[PDB]
A paper describes a structure:
ATP-binding cassette (ABC) transporters catalyze the translocation of a wide range of substrates across membranes and support a variety of physiological processes including ion homeostasis, adaptative immune responses, lipid distribution, and detoxification. They consist of two cytosolic nucleotide-binding domains (NBDs) that can bind and hydrolyze ATP which promotes conformational changes in their transmembrane domains (TMDs). The ABCC family also expands the canonical ABC architecture with the addition of a long disordered link between NBD1 and TMD2 called the regulatory domain (R-domain) in some ABCC transporters. Some of the relevant transporters included in this family are CFTR, involved in chloride ion homeostasis; multidrug resistance protein 1 (MRP1) involved in the secretion of leukotrienes and drugs; the sulfonylurea receptor 1 (SUR1) a potassium channel that regulates insulin secretion; and the yeast cadmium factor 1, which is responsible for heavy metal and drug detoxification in yeast.
We expressed and purified the NBD2 Walker B mutant E1435Q Ycf1 in the Saccharomyces cerevisiae DSY5 strain and in the Materials and Methods section. After phosphorylation treatment with cAMP-PKA and size exclusion chromatography, cryo-EM grids were prepared as described in the Materials and Methods section. This approach yielded homogenous particles from which we identified a single inward-facing conformation in a 3.23 Å map. The overall conformation has previously been unobserved with a 40.0 Å separation between NBDs, ∼5 Å wider separation than the previous widest model (G668 on NBD1 and S1411 on NBD2). The high-quality map allowed the first-time modeling of four phosphorylation sites (S903, S908, T911, and S914) in a single ABC transporter R-domain. The S903 residue and its phosphate group make extensive interactions in a highly basic pocket defined by the surface of NBD1 (L619, K655, H803, K805, and K807) and R-insertion (615–643), especially at the K617 site, the latest being consistent with the R-insertion of CFTR in a proposed alternate conformation. The cryo-EM maps of the enriched tetra-phosphorylated Ycf1 also reveal a continuous R-domain density that encloses entirely around NBD1 in a path resembling previously published Ycf1 structures.
Residue numbers in the entry: 1 to 332, 335 to 857, 882 to 891, 900 to 1515
């Protein structure tokens, strides 16, 4: 059948070169250029030209005129010029050349095509926004086609000495190349001009439009539209407003509606619906396009080793013929020698393959990640929309955390599947190509290498498993250390007061240095083994394959069988290793689809549960009618739980209808029926007008108080103030610091229940709804406040007198004013009627509940304070949400000077042993150098085989080659062991010890000002990053950096002229690296912060589904969810394309390196010095450089993100410590305090330098062993006297003398240790009872038991567990009562052998019985100690022998209790009169 075609092809082409694709000279033949490339591009231009022409003529003119400029006349001029040259070329055809059908058909088709192009340029300029894709590809293909025609003509002239179309044909084709190139540049480069008219509307847009929509096809391929964003993010920090809008197809509303339409189509039109089929039906097209580009990428990827094989064969045969003919120049026709130009065009073919592979690869990634974003947006919005209509049976079925995790986890899993979906076929497809390539290259010996890779797969999996086990144990010890630090920080006050810093620091170091770092050493060793395995296996595949080849095959192991084999094995390594990841992704995704499908199929609310209708007009009209013996069920499956039975409820406009009964008696169910939450099995139900609703639990959004009251309604100053006054919220609003601007709920200030209920009701009144459904709002409200609410809101004289009101409450006050009552017992309404009817019908129980109940500043404050038909509220325009990050902008005050803080890197290098860092870098060089010399020996081995034509001394060459591979592998083993054992672990031990010693030594002002959570975060997260992650990133960076440096010097050694290529590419590489570093880091930050509000909002919605469904604000809440999805995706879209912007440039740079190495090598072949080994070795290394450039840029980003952890750690390490703990010469005697003589010498102090004085000129002198009471008003600084005594805050003026030695000269340890304390903040450390009494183990157990006996704590300690002192205590002392903690603090205090005690009870009022026993123990046991008593209540002070009166930091009165009471005008007496003690006295 095909025999006719073979003969028919001979008739078309008459040139002796033939129709074949590649000529003898390595270029496209004349018949192939004219017959195929130019004809196909002409047919392409014709069929797609007229396609676009009819489309652009059918399409309506948009009205946006583009100004006719020098662009359009230049394009039309050059296209006319091109038509002229094609005409002249047609005339230049000779008589013999007319015989070729191909060339005449080429000029005919090109001439016809140019008229279509001439028209389409005009239509494109007039109407099309972007430069038309068809024109750009047409001029690209004809630039290529005419350039190939030029090179063909020039090669035939140079080698054969005849112009194949005359000099005229050469000159015309030269001008056609120049004309086509200039038309391509004028089409692609210049920006489209615009008329001045339409620019007035550019101020309406909020954000700039996406440049992707305006990007022509070359810009889309090269991703050059990202370049402007990269320059912006390099130059400054990216604010949210800088990010462009999403492209037109990415809106969450459009995607969700598309997937919703497909999904409900599956539900309706199939008996076995599947969510997966719906997804793959609606987003399946671009995945097919991605698969097509992946197939092209695989073919082009595996073309490169074959071109390398061709080139090495060419260089071998070129040198062979030079040596053969030069050695036989003695003789006198020789065949046509190999042309050197064939080498250059092979070198250029490698560039074209690398460039095309780069382009299709990133178009594959573009379509893949775009599909991932589409599936994420569509599923997220569908999940939210399904949440609003979940039946309460379904809502109670599943927990809130699981439903949020559907959005947060499962959708993220399906997004990740889209990345790896194409590898199910591309993996086998790449493997099948590679095995076929290797089989033809090496024969049967390939299978030994494949067996080794397959065998080493489970070994890799086993190492990953045990690595995961070690990582989990590392995380467990991290949590252990974090919890210990948390207890230390939370109880830092007691820790400093008792001088317990040393034992708890020793406890922390025992955990750290004994368990965590020991486990980290094990992790380091196993990572070293993993690195050794990853380094030896790529060698061992090639070494074993060549070993088996040489003995079994008689063929010579030449270079072409070796370096292409190494490249092919390297390409084989990746796809054979990703398959376990792909399969794991599929299983995880299959689980996620199961979760989502089960979620979407949950039972939804019955829409017809109630007929909701427009409002009723007249007062007294029936706004609610439930009747006909209506029956409603809580659940339809599995249990038919009848919620309500025989309901006949009816309510009228303006009247207050009350539902009364026990909890669960049906009252909350009947309100749920009005909302339509319950399923209606029988009866009819109606509700008229807008509904406002209040849940029994007051649900509050986490926004502002004003946002909670408005709740999407427009602002109105009069009603906003009026409702605040009506709800008695003004006093509560005034007490709040920022008033209505205060944040609310979980993130903001927590509100008390009665205050919370008032805010919830205030929302309802502001809506001005037609019907009010109130599920017991007065339960958490005080009586007098409730009366105020009954007067102004609910009463007939209130705001809502004209509105319908339903109030399910049982309080007597509400029932008295209520119009009609309904009695509801256990889901059955017994009887209803007006309140007057029941009053005379006293025999019924409704009167009885009133009977048995029976019978000023707060009431006055509550009571401190026509308009026919209050018009309803207006819902405000939804508009658009913009994320708020103003605090973050304040943090980034630098505005991206962005120069690297090299002081951090040097400080970290000094944290590691700097000598060990040099050793670590040394073994990287030794590793790579041996690996490079391993290939050099392989080059020498292959050359010897090629020269001999056999395999002489196979054992000798193979043994030496094996030795160098093991040498390189052992160097990586020693590299990673030195990394973890010596460098990384030493730095982690050094940094953590430096930080803990500094933080524990820091003064109290540091702990007070800084949040405790922030300090704990730096102890946990930053140390974890330094231990596990920071060492990893440096090792990956230096290994790849040294790898590229050895790759460069190998190529330069083979061809010294390559230096001139590296320098321009080096500056471009650094130029792209810096732009990616700043921009991609900032885009990831924006992406991260924008993720969380979507989940927090959805969790917030789930709490208040009843409220949202009550007010019918579903559309508003749905819109808010859609807007927050787009805000996150607006940051995610440029973040992803940042990678493809970078990866295109680096692969382009890598492709140019391959061109430079190949072409300069062939230039060296003309000199005659080149050998087959040199081009094989240098060019083989050049192919691998593209991956290493990607690693270096990526690891630099990882280094910068993690190195800030070292900066934060050093920030706390540099904290200025307080006064020294010990002064060597000034240490007091062991007996000190000998007596307890306290003397103050004009003492004065401030809490902080910036704060005013809190003590002034204190001259207090305390006799030994006197009971001193401290009395003072709030804010007098009475509590500051405690801190002054222990030097917790330094003395601004004066000094304190305890037993004729000033404590200022005494170290803080000697001061704080020798004094007994019962602090205000009673605190319990996590640990044993023994740990909380004597962590230093200074005292015997008998003394401890005596202390527990005196504290009345001995029996309770024995009761907790049989072990006694070893009994554990929970974190924070949760197991112990608050009063018990006071006794425990008392147990600590009495055990200290010192003669001075200070007792602080400035706020201790929890319980009196624990106070009484504490008091009696103080009087009895502590007789010999000088006691200072700081007490809130004066009753504890009246028995004191001496009393200090502190007022405004001065010594107001220092008198006995009798003198104070005798002086009725004293400050102490007046304070007692305020407390009422004077009345008793």
């Amino acid at each position: 059948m095909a025999g006719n075609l073979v003969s028919w092809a001979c008739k078309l082409c008459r040139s002796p070169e033939g129709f074949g694709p590649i000529s003898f000279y390595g270029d496209f033949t004349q018949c192939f250029i004219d017959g195929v490339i130019l004809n196909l591009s002409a047919i392409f231009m014709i069929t797609f030209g007229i396609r676009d022409l009819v489309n652009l003529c059918k399409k309506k003119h948009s009205g946006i005129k583009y100004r006719r400029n020098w662009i359009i006349v230049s394009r039309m001029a050059l296209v006319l010029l091109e038509i002229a040259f094609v005409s002249l070329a047609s005339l230049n055809i000779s008589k013999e050349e007319a015989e070729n059908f191909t060339i005449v058909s080429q000029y005919a088709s090109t001439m016809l095509s140019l008229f279509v192009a001439l028209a389409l340029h005009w239509i494109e300029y007039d109407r099309s926004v972007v430069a038309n894709t068809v024109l750009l590809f047409y001029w690209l293909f004809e630039t290529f086609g005419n350039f190939a025609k030029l090179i063909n003509i020039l090669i035939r002239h140079t080698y054969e000495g005849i112009w194949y179309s005359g000099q005229t044909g050469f000159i015309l084709t030269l001008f056609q190349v120049i004309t086509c190139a200039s038309i391509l540049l004028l089409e692609a480069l210049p920006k489209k001009p615009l008329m001045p008219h339409q620019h007035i509307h550019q101020t309406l847009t909020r954000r700039k439009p996406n440049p992707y929509d305006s990007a022509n096809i070359f810009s889309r391929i090269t991703f050059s539209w990202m370049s402007g964003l990269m320059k912006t993010g390099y130059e400054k920090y990216l604010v949210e407003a800088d990010l462009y809008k999403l492209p037109r197809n990415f809106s969450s509303e459009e995607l969700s509606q598309k997937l919703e339409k497909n999904w409900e189509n599956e539900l309706k039109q199939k008996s076995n619906p599947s969510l997966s089929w719906a997804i793959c039906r609606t987003f399946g097209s671009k995945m097919l396009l991605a698969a097509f580009f992946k197939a092209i990428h695989d073919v082009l990827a595996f073309t490169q080793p074959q071109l390398l094989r061709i080139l090495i064969k060419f260089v071998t045969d070129y040198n062979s013929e030079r040596q053969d003919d030069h050695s036989s120049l003695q003789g006198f026709n020789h065949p046509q020698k190999l042309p050197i130009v064939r080498g250059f065009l092979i070198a250029f073919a490698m560039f074209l393959v690398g460039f095309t592979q780069t382009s299709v690869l990133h178009q594959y990634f573009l379509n893949v990640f775009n599909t991932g974003m589409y599936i994420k947006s569509a599923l997220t919005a569908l999940i939210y929309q399904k949440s609003l209509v979940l039946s309460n049976e379904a809502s109670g079925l599943s927990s809130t955390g699981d439903i949020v995790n559907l959005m947060s986890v499962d959708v993220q899993k399906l997004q990740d599947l889209t990345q790896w979906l194409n590898l199910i076929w591309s993996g086998p497809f790449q493997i099948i190509i590679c095995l076929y390539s290797l089989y033809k290259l090496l024969g049967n010996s390939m299978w030994v290498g494949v067996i080794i890779l397959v065998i080493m797969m489970p070994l890799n999996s086993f190492l990953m498993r045990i690595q995961k086990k070690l990582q989990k144990s590392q995380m467990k010890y991290k949590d252990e250390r974090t919890r210990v630090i948390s207890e230390i920080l939370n109880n830092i006050k007691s820790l400093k007061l008792y001088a317990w810093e040393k034992p708890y620091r020793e406890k922390l170091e025992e955990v750290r240095n004994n368990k965590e770092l020991k486990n980290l050493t094990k992790l380091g060793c196993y990572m070293a083994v993993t690195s050794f395995q990853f380094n030896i296996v790529p060698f061992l595949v090639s070494c074993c394959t060549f070993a088996v080849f040489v003995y079994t095959e008689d063929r010579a192991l030449t270079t072409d069988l070796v370096f292409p084999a190494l490249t092919l094995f390297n390409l084989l390594s990746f796809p054979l290793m990703i398959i376990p990841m792909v399969l794991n992704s599929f299983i995880e995704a299959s689980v996620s689809i199961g979760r989502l499908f089960t979620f979407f199929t949950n039972e939804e609310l019955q829409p017809d549960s109630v007929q909701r209708l427009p409002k009723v007009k007249n007062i007294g009209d029936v706004a609610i009618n439930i009747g006909d013996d209506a029956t409603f069920l809580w659940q339809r499956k599995p249990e038919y739980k009848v919620a309500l039975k025989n309901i006949n409820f009816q309510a009228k406009k303006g009247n207050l209808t009350c539902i009364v009964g026990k909890v669960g008696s049906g009252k909350t169910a009947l309100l749920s029926c009005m909302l339509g939450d319950l399923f209606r099995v029988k009866g009819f139900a109606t509700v008229h007008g807008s509904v406002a609703y209040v849940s029994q639990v007051p649900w509050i959004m986490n926004g502002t108080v004003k946002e909670n009251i408005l709740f999407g309604h427009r602002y109105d100053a009069e009603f906003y103030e009026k409702t605040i006054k009506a709800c008695a919220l003004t006093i509560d609003l005034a007490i709040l610091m920022d008033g209505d601007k205060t944040l609310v709920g979980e993130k903001g200030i927590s509100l008390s229940g009665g205050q919370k209920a008032r805010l919830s009701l205030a929302r309802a009144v502001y809506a001005r709804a037609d019907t009010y459904l109130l599920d017991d709002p007065l339960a958490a409200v005080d009586e007098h406040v409730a009366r105020h609410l009954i007067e102004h809101v609910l009463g007939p004289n209130g705001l809502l007198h004209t509105k319908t009101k339903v109030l399910a409450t049982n309080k007597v006050s509400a029932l008295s004013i209520a119009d009609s009552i309904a009695l509801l017992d256990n889901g059955e309404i017994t009887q209803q009627g007006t309140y007057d009817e029941i009053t005379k019908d006293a025999d019924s129980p409704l009167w009885k509940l009133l009977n048995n109940y029976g019978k000023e500043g707060e009431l006055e404050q509550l009571q401190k304070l026509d308009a026919i038909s209050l018009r309803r509220a207006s819902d405000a325009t939804l508009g658009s949400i913009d994320f708020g990050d103003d605090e973050n902008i304040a943090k980034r005050e630098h505005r991206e000077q962005g120069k690297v803080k090299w002081n951090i890197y040097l400080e970290y290098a000094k944290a590691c042993n700097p000598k060990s860092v040099c050793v670590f870098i040394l073994f990287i060089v030794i590793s790579m150098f041996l690996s490079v010399m391993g290939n050099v020996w392989l080059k020498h081995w292959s050359e010897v085989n090629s020269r001999y034509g056999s395999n002489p001394n196979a054992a000798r060459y193979l043994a030496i080659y094996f030795a160098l591979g093991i040498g390189s592998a052992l160097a990586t083993l020693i590299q990673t062991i030195v990394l973890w054992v010596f460098c990384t672990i030493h730095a982690s031990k050094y940094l953590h010890n430096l930080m803990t010693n500094s933080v524990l030594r820091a003064p109290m002002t540091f702990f007070e000002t800084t949040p405790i959570g922030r300090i704990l975060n730096r102890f946990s997260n930053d140390i974890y990053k330094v231990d596990a992650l920071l060492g990893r990133t440096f090792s990956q960076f230096f290994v790849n950096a040294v790898k590229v440096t050895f790759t460069i010097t190998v190529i330069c050694a083979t061809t010294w002229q390559f230096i001139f290529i590296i320098i321009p590419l080096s500056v471009f590489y650094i130029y792209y690296q810096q732009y990616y570093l700043r921009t991609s880091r900032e885009l990831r930050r924006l992406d991260s912060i924008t993720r969380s509000p979507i989940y927090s909002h959805f969790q917030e919605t789930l709490g208040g589904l009843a409220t949202v469904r009550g007010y019918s604000q579903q559309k508003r809440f749905s819109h808010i969810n859609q807007c927050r999805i787009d805000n996150n995706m607006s940051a995610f879209y440029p973040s992803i394309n940042a990678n493809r912007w970078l990866a295109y440039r680096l692969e382009l740079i890598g492709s140019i390196i391959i061109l430079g190495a190949a072409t300069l090598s062939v230039f060296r072949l003309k000199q005659g010095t080149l050998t087959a080994g040199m081009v094989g070795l240098s060019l083989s290394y050049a192919l691998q450089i593209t991956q290493t450039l990607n690693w270096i840029v990526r690891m630099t980003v990882e280094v910068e993100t993690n190195i800030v952890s070292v900066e934060r750690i050093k920030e706390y390490a540099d904290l200025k410590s307080e006064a020294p703990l010990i002064v060597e010469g000034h240490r007091p005697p062991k007996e000190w305090p000998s007596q307890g003589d306290i003397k103050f010498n004009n003492y004065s102090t401030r809490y902080r330098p910036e704060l005013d004085l809190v003590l002034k000129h204190i001259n207090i002198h305390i006799k030994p062993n006197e009971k001193v009471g401290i009395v003072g008003r709030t804010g007098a600084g009475k509590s500051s006297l405690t801190l002054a005594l222990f030097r917790m805050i330094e003395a601004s003026e004066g000094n304190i003398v305890i037993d004729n030695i000033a404590i200022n000269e005494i170290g803080l340890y000697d001061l704080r240790h020798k004094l007994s304390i019962i602090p205000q903040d009673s605190q319990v450390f996590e640990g044993t009872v023994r740990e909380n009494i004597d962590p230093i183990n200074q005292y015997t157990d008998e003394a401890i038991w005596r202390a527990l006996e005196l504290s009345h704590l001995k029996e309770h300690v024995l009761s907790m567990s049989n072990d006694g002192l070893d009994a554990q205590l929970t974190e924070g002392g949760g197991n112990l009562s608050v009063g018990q903690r006071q006794l425990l603090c008392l147990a600590r205090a009495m055990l200290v052998p010192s003669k001075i005690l200070v007792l602080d009870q400035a706020t201790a009022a929890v319980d009196v019985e624990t106070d009484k026993v504490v008091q009696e123990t103080i009087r009895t046991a502590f007789k010999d100690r000088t006691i200072l008593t700081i007490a809130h209540r004066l009753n504890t002070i009246m028995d004191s022998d001496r009393i200090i009166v502190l007022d405004n930091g001065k010594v107001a009165e220092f008198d006995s209790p009798g003198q104070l009471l005798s002086d009725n005008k004293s400050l102490f007496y007046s304070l007692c009169m305020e407390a009422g003690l004077v009345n008793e006295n």
